[PDB]
């Protein structure tokens, strides 16, 4: 159930002593290493041509946040604050009130994308699939406060990426 790495005594007949001395004087293993490096020289390299080719992803992928809507236009967030209660970085800040037609909807729904740890607890705690963590990951900013998303930026990410988020959730939701 155990093995001894490096416990081989070298043979001491004239054949193997001459082989080790030719290895010392004629550098067998150094030519072996050069042969392996030359063997990787003649290969097709694994470099994809980004930004024209994209690395492979799964429909489970956790990128930029987005608030979804029902297939009626009504947004799914009903202000229940499970996503900010489960959020391990406390990046989510929610404040709500009953709106003009008496519905439990949010007024403030902020996700600080510089606190957020992209772990997808908010999308798996959300009981109505409102907040999801979408497939975009190329959303770098030149300014720090552009990564402080309010409700309007999250709703625009939802209305931007819904045609892809709906298909990822459609391919994935049976595992949840």
């Amino acid at each position: 159930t155990y093995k001894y790495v490096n416990l081989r005594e070298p043979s001491m007949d004239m054949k193997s002593v001459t082989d080790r001395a030719a290895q010392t004087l004629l550098w067998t293993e150094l030519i072996r290493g050069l042969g392996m490096t030359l063997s990787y020289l003649f290969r097709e390299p694994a470099t994809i041509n980004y930004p024209f080719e994209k690395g492979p992803l799964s429909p489970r992928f956790r990128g930029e946040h987005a608030l979804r809507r029902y297939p009626s236009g009504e947004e799914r967030c009903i202000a229940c604050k499970l996503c900010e209660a489960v959020c391990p970085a406390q990046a989510i800040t929610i404040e709500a009130e009953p709106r003009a037609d008496g519905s439990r909807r949010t007024t403030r729904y902020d996700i600080d994308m510089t606190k957020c740890i992209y772990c997808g607890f908010c999308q798996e705690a959300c009981p109505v699939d409102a907040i999801v963590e979408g497939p975009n990951f190329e959303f770098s900013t030149e300014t720090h406060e552009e990564l402080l998303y309010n409700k309007e930026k999250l709703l625009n990410n939802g209305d931007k990426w819904e045609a892809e988020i709906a298909a990822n959730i459609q391919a994935d939701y049976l595992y949840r």
């Binding site: 030359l38 063997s39 003649f42 097709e44 492979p56 049976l174 595992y175």
Partner: protein, 55 residues
């Protein structure tokens, strides 16, 4: 996999191993990106009888 047989043979000679049997570049043999919908099995306590929580 498109390496010509002279370069393929030189590359096998330089490594000393058979390299086309074990390629570190992936091709058609890997799984499909679009998988059929699954059916996950339920646990042992998904029962309607003899399933009290206290036991």
């Amino acid at each position: 996999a498109s390496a010509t047989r002279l370069i393929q043979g030189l590359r096998n000679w330089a490594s000393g191993r058979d390299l086309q049997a074990k390629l570190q570049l992936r091709y058609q043999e890997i799984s499909k990106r679009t998988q059929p919908p699954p059916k996950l099995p339920v646990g042992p306590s998904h029962r309607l009888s003899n399933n009290y929580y206290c036991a």
